[PDB]
Structures are given as C-alpha cells and as structure tokens.
C-alpha cells in the first residue's frame, strides 16, 4: 500500500524567501504538500497544493527528492519540487491559517520537522532560479509491424492521445513556453494539445529523429544546446532511441546525477539549467503510470 503525495518549496525574490505554512490540524509549521487525486501526476499535485494551501501560482523547477512517512500497512511517499511564485495572494483556507515568507536560515529554524529541513537543504544545494528544458518521449503509437505505410506517419493510438492530453497540465506545471518535435507524426501529435493550449506552433526537428541521431550524435547534441540556449522553457518531443544518449551526454558534461531514470512512452525529463549549465535531470513517469 503506497500512498502518492507531492509537495513544494515555494519561493520568491525578497534575496530568496521561502513560504512556510501553519496548519491548525497539528498546530505547527511545514511545507505545502498533499495526496494525489485519481489520475493526477506528482508535479500537477504539487502545483495544486501550492494553489490550495498558499493561494499562489507558481512554476515548478528542480525536483528535491522524496520523503517517506509510515502509515498503517504501508507508506506515504512525498516528492518535492522547488517552485517559484508567479502571483496570487495568501488567504486563510481549510488547511492553512497563516503563511510566512522567510529567508532560508530563518525558515530552517521555523521548520521543526527533520524531513522538511532535509528538503530545504536539498533546495539550497543548487540554484533555484532555473530555466527548464522538457524532453518528452512521444506517447503510445501501436506496433510498427501492424502499420504498413510510411512509418514517419504512424499516429498515436487511443491511449497515446490520452497521454498527449494529460501532458498539457504536466508540462504547463513547469512553465513550458516553446515547442519542438522530431520529424515524426507521433512526436508532433504528443504535443499538439499543448500547442493548442499555448497558442504556439511546433518547430520541426529533423536532426532529432532516431535515424538522424543514429547517423550523427554530434549534430543532435549541438542542436539540443542551440534550442536550450534560447530564452524560454522549450518542450522537445522525440523518440526512444534518441533520449537516453542525449540525457546521459548532458548529465556527463555537467556532472549531474539523475535520481530516477527510465524511457517510457509519454515520459518527461525535466532538465533544469542555471545560466546555461545543467543542474538537474528529473525523470517523470508517463502521466497514466505510477
Ligand atoms: N527503435 C526502434 N524500434 C523498432 C524498430 N523497428 C521496430 O519494429 N521497432 C519496435 C521495437 C520498439 O520497442 C518499438 C518502438 O515503438 P515506437 O512507437 O516506434 O517508439 P519510438 O518512436 O522508437 O520511440 O518498435 C527500429 O528500427 N527502431
């Protein structure tokens, strides 16, 4: 029995201040967090908990690890994010009666739970004013052997179209602003719902297909850095044989260790950048998977 939850270190420029919330249920101070609703992903729940408990909007950045809490016959797992406030105002609500903004050392003294102090230590370990590259493996698209036509053109299946829809809220939680996809229909279709939401066109990326990458890794890596260097938070949707090598290459060049890893259809790598340099690589499950 594993209960899935998420939470955040909500912060703003004062130079950084962090929000600490008071909960009358236990009469003490902590960080925003809560359980995932049915169908929800961790990032979307973290942002939702920020909204409900603090009244603020925010954009999630780097993942800050997990905390595990004993419950009867199982555990509650809470994944945390850094989250930069983007607006909104605190109002007392059904969970939280008070909110204070504190420099990190004062926040550390206010947080009497060891696990919250641990999350805050993870927060200060690396920069938090980060830009984000979102590398997405396209959603499910059936089997190649069942499709007789030009395999470039093979579309998402029903499940995959649902993953594309569910990725809108996932990717919005990280403040996606610009859109890129490898030159395959299944990659474009994965981000078309987001394109409709953002009112953004999808920029085609011939260098980031499986066949291109297999023939030239260096062009793909160079193109990835070009995309990443532009201001904004780009989403780049590509293929299974492309992503692992790109993620590994970037992590090696930056000396960044991913806490988790995978490469499922519909999954996302959140790549956090400080001044152009990678500082986090966070693998997210497909939205319809734990
Ligand atoms: N990577 C790869 N998979 C193939 C090929 N031929 C083939 O039948 N497969 C099978 C085995 C792979 O597990 C599967 C990949 O499914 P997809 O929706 O194409 O995803 P992707 O765009 O690769 O991310 O297709 C091939 O030439 N390359």
Curated annotation (Swiss-Prot):
InterPro entries: His_Pase_superF_clade-1, His_PPase_superfam, Nudix_hydrolase, NUDIX_hydrolase-like_dom_sf, NUDIX_hydrolase_CS, NUDIX_hydrolase_dom. Its cofactor is Mg(2+). Ap4A hydrolysis is inhibited by fluoride ions. Residues 1-124 form the Nudix hydrolase domain. It catalyses: 8-oxo-dGTP + H2O = 8-oxo-dGDP + phosphate + H(+); 8-oxo-GTP + H2O = 8-oxo-GDP + phosphate + H(+); 8-oxo-dGDP + H2O = 8-oxo-dGMP + phosphate + H(+); 8-oxo-GDP + H2O = 8-oxo-GMP + phosphate + H(+). It holds the Pfam family NUDIX. Its EC number is 3.6.1.69, 3.6.1.58, 3.6.1.61. Coiled coil: none annotated. It is an enzyme of class 3 (hydrolase). CDD domains: HP_PGM_like, NUDIX_Ap6A_hydrolase. Mg(2+) 2 binds at residues 49, 53, 95. Mg(2+) 1 binds at residues 33, 53, 95. Keywords: DNA damage, DNA repair, DNA replication, Hydrolase, Magnesium, Metal-binding. Substrate binds at residues 23-26, 28, 33-35, 69, 76, 95, 113. Disruption phenotype: 12-fold spontaneous mutation frequency increase by rifampicin resistance screening. Contains an N-terminal Nudix hydrolase domain, followed by a linker region and a C-terminal histidine phosphatase domain. The C-terminal domain is necessary for efficient catalysis by the Nudix hydrolase domain. Catalyzes the conversion of 8-oxo-dGTP to 8-oxo-dGDP, and 8-oxo-GTP to 8-oxo-GDP. At high enzyme concentrations, can also catalyze the conversion of 8-oxo-dGDP to 8-oxo-dGMP, and 8-oxo-GDP to 8-oxo-GMP. In addition, catalyzes the hydrolysis of the diadenosine polyphosphates diadenosine hexaphosphate (Ap6A), diadenosine pentaphosphate (Ap5A) and diadenosine tetraphosphate (Ap4A). Belongs to the Nudix hydrolase family. This is 8-oxo-(d)GTP phosphatase. It comes from Mycolicibacterium smegmatis (strain ATCC 700084 / mc(2)155).
């Amino acid at each position: 029995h594993t209960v899935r939850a998420a939470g955040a270190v909500l912060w703003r420029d004062a130079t950084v201040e962090v929000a600490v919330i008071h909960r009358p249920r236990y009469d003490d101070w902590s960080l925003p967090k809560g359980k995932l609703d049915q169908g929800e992903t961790e990032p979307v729940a973290a942002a939702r908990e920020i909204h409900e408990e603090t009244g603020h909007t925010a954009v999630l950045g780097r993942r800050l690890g997990r905390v595990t809490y004993p419950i009867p016959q199982g555990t509650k797992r809470v994944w945390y994010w850094a989250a930069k406030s983007t607006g909104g105002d605190f109002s007392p609500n059904d969970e939280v009666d008070k909110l204070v903004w504190l420099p990190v050392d004062a926040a550390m003294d206010q947080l009497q739970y060891p696990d919250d102090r641990k999350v805050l230590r993870r927060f200060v370990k690396r920069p938090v004013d980060t830009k984000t590259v979102l590398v997405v493996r396209h959603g499910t698209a059936g089997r190649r052997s069942r499709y007789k036509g030009d395999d470039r053109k093979r579309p998402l299946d029903k499940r995959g179209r649902a993953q594309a829809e569910a990725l809108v809220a996932q990717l919005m939680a990280f403040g996606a602003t610009t859109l890129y996809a490898a030159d395959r229909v299944r990659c474009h279709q994965t981000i078309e719902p987001l394109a409709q939401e953002l009112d953004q066109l999808i920029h085609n990326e011939p260098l980031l297909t499986e066949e291109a990458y297999a023939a030239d890794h260096k062009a793909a890596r160079k193109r990835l850095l070009e995309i990443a260097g532009r201001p904004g938070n780009p989403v780049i949707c590509t293929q299974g044989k492309v992503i692992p090598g790109l993620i590994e290459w970037w992590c090696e060049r930056a000396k960044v260790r991913p806490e988790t890893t995978g490469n499922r259809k519909g999954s996302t790598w959140v790549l956090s950048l400080s001044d152009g340099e990678l500082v986090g690589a966070d693998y997210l499950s497909p939205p319809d998977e734990k």
